[PDB]
């Protein structure tokens, strides 16, 4: 009866409440995609266990085409519901059902602020400055994927000398965009959750994509279709947006 | 198989070709909507057969909840398909099938250049400059549902005086804009398009709202998850991508 949503560690969409003692169960979390949950959770009726992915991953397949992370939990029907900025792919809507997205964004560049650097092009055309995206994200999979000729070219790069320009996460590419000269490609929402708290890194140019994330089903659960009912009826209402603001909004920035 | 498409003509998604002789069955149309049907029927490999929707409606519903317009063909099982700027909607959704977005826009204002209004609540605080959408579409109706205080005031005001301030189609509430003091709630992309070919017009603030296109299907159609499918690989290839620019791009403004 109870629900299983399968989620992942990702801020501000799923974050450790801070508290002076241990805390247990949907009690742990809190964020935009909590927030969702229980809005969703409202209107559906359901009641629901929030789970993290045991192997911390959002949903990739190996050499054999056996999927991981949240993308397997709901695969293999231990999961109910994925409730994460998981990105709505063509391979990964073969595999599971998504709603219709909560939120719309696209890949851009984290950088730091000050420089000539205007675009994806202008990166591409050079050597000087290194850039990368998260491994096996679907950033990744983007460039690994295009036949547009700047983003093959952007694509050798990354891929070159065993991928050291790509990282583990986006707080390693954070980091590395904040110590060295490096750009990070990043989904948008992303970046202007960072930009919001570091005032010394902007976005470069504009959405390279278009995507959304969508809230994750196993194939043909009865729950996609109500669920994207809902999405609709809470982004028709305002809803979907004051949340966003609520977890975006960084009071420290010029 | 042949699949019944139903569609609307809608500039630029679907318009009738120029031709010195007359034209007769698919060869009479052209636009984004028809190409983005040449390449569904590419990947999904059907034959099609595009009809104008009788009554030249999208799809609303009157007070005894029954559907008119593209909405209705296909609740009534008289198309296979409806490939339109059809928005996805809550109430639709409850009745039809959508595909996820193969376009996505939000609701923004389209106004003369060179004026001080710069958003919604510029408009919503007077009543000097009127304003007001195409009646029975998707605009008006998120304003009729809106309970937020802004867009109830903007509601408020459409509705005032037997609707005076609503207009029956996008070309009537553009000429309108063009020769009084008037302002149109209208789709941001249908804005994008304008705008690009009168010189004189703009975009007014940002987006409202954030939603999408779909293509339609009946409920509980098979084709409603491959087209899914189908458009996912088309934005991923950045097809979508070249069509908009295909049929958007006008020929520049001083
Ligand atoms: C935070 C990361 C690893 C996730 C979030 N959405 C993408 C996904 O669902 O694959 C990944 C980001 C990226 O690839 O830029
Ligand atoms: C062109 C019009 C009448 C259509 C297009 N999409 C909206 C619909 O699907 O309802 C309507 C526009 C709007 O309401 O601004
Ligand atoms: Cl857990
Ligand atoms: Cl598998
Ligand atoms: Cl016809
Ligand atoms: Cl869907
Ligand atoms: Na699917
Ligand atoms: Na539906």
Redesign the pocket.
């Known amino acids: 009866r109870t629900l299983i949503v399968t989620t992942i560690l990702?801020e501000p969409y799923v974050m450790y409440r801070k508290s002076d003692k241990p805390l247990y169960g949907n009690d742990r979390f809190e964020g935009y995609c909590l927030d969702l949950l229980k809005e969703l959770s409202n209107i559906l009726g359901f009641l629901y266990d929030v789970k993290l992915v045991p192997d911390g991953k959002?949903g990739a397949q190996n050499d054999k085409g056996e999927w991981n992370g949240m993308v397997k939990e709901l695969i293999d029907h231990r999961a109910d519901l994925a409730v994460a900025?998981?990105?709505i792919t063509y391979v990964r809507e073969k595999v599971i059902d998504f709603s219709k997205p909560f939120m719309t964004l696209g890949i851009s560049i984290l950088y730091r602020k000050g420089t000539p650097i205007d675009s994806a092009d202008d990166l591409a055309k050079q050597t000087k400055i290194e850039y990368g995206?998260?491994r096996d994200?679907?950033?990744?999979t983007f460039f690994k994927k295009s036949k547009i000729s700047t983003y093959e070219k952007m694509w050798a790069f990354m891929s070159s000398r065993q991928q050291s320009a790509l990282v583990k996460?986006?707080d390693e590419g954070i980091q590395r965009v904040l110590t060295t000269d490096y750009a990070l490609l990043?989904?948008s929402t992303?970046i202007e959750y960072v930009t919001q708290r570091n005032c010394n890194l902007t976005q470069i140019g504009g959405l390279i994509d278009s995507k959304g994330y969508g809230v994750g089903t196993p194939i043909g659960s009865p729950y996609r279709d109500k669920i994207t009912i809902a999405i609709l009826q809470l982004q028709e209402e305002g809803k979907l947006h004051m949340m966003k603001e609520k977890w975006w909004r960084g009071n420290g920035c010029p």
Chains 1, 2 share one sequence.
């Open positions: 990702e959002y900025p998981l990105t995206a998260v994200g679907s950033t990744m996460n986006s990043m989904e992303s």
